[PDB]
Every structure is written in structure tokens, then in C-alpha cells.
Write a protein that binds this ligand. Structure first.
Ligand code: NI
Length: 121
């Protein structure tokens, strides 16, 4: 019952910055987190960042600590991922997810289609 639409992906120079957005239709259940995950070809899906809709507390993967920032706009029911100091190994499809807990992907039952991010060398 929740639809999620990512935007902001595409092509960026290594060292550069992007900001992804995720527009959501409904509210997260059965838990209250919104999360960004990413999946590169041949690899497992990886958690990137998550935040508690209940009380705005945030969690990051070690891989992106100090470079990425998650935030939200309650009024717009949108979350954001600010992605700075990008590297070629950050290339992936980035997904927004709702209704899970922290970076436990199996707890999320609502997923976007994903937005591709490609960072040069
Ligand atoms: Ni549902």
C-alpha cells in the first residue's frame, strides 16, 4: 500500500555530490524506519542509511560514514540522501525502502524501483 519513487540519480564525477529524493505515498509499517540501500551488479544489497520516522534518529553504513547524510521532510512525506565525496565504488542502483528497522533489509516490505548512480573514474 506504500509506493516509493526515487529521483536524483544519474552520472557524476568522482569526488562530486548528488542528492537523491524519495517521495512516499503511505506510512511506514510494521516498523517506522525509512532506509536507503544500494545494490551493485553481482553483489548483495547493502544498507546505506536509515532514519526513524518516529524520532529522527539516523544510522549509517561504515562504507558511507562522514560522506552521506539522510534527512526527511514530514510535510512532504519525502526522505533525502545527500551523497558527497563520491567514489567509483559507490556506483549502484539506490533504493528507497519503508516500513523496516535500521539497515535490516529483510524487515522492509516496501521498496522503490531504484535510481541508478554512476560515478566516474
Ligand atoms: Ni504494507
Amino acid at each position: 500500500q506504500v509506493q516509493l519513487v526515487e529521483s536524483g540519480g544519474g552520472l557524476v564525477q568522482a569526488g562530486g555530490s548528488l542528492r537523491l529524493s524519495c517521495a512516499a505515498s503511505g506510512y511506514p509499517h510494521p516498523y517506522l524506519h525509512m532506509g536507503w540501500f544500494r545494490q551493485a551488479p553481482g553483489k548483495e544489497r547493502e544498507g546505506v542509511a536509515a532514519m526513524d520516522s518516529g524520532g529522527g534518529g539516523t544510522l549509517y553504513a561504515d562504507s558511507v560514514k562522514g560522506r552521506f547524510t539522510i534527512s526527511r521532510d514530514k510535510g512532504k512525506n519525502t526522505v533525502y540522501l545527500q551523497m558527497d565525496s563520491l567514489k567509483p565504488e559507490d556506483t549502484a542502483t539506490y533504493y528507497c525502502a519503508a516500513g523496516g528497522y535500521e539497515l535490516r533489509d529483510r524487515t522492509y516490505g516496501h521498496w522503490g524501483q531504484g535510481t541508478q548512480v554512476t560515478v566516474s573514474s
